[PDB]
Amino acid sequence: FLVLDRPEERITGINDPRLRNPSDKFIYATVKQSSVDIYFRRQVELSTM
Amino acid sequence: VATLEERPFVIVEPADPISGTCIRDSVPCRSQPEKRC
Secondary structure, three states, X not given: OOOOOXXXXXXXXXXXXXXXXXXXXXXXXXXXXXXXHHHHXXXXXXXXX | OOOOOEOOOEOOOXXXXXXXXXXXXXXXXXXXXXXXX
16 A cells, blocks of 8 residues: 555656647647747747647 | 558548648558548
């Protein structure tokens, strides 16, 4: 009872496959017009999620 | 080149009307005619 406790719910890095697929069970968000918005728009691959 | 649709390998969806063009990282796919990405 005092050892086994592991939901294993840990998003590991950007490269996690959960982020890549735009599943509706989770919603991702950021801050408008910030630097991260520029970072994603500039990338020629990340405009899929 | 002739092609078909299978979800994990090739995905065909209609283009965005506001953009009026195929989205990036995609190719036009004429049917056999409405352009789809």
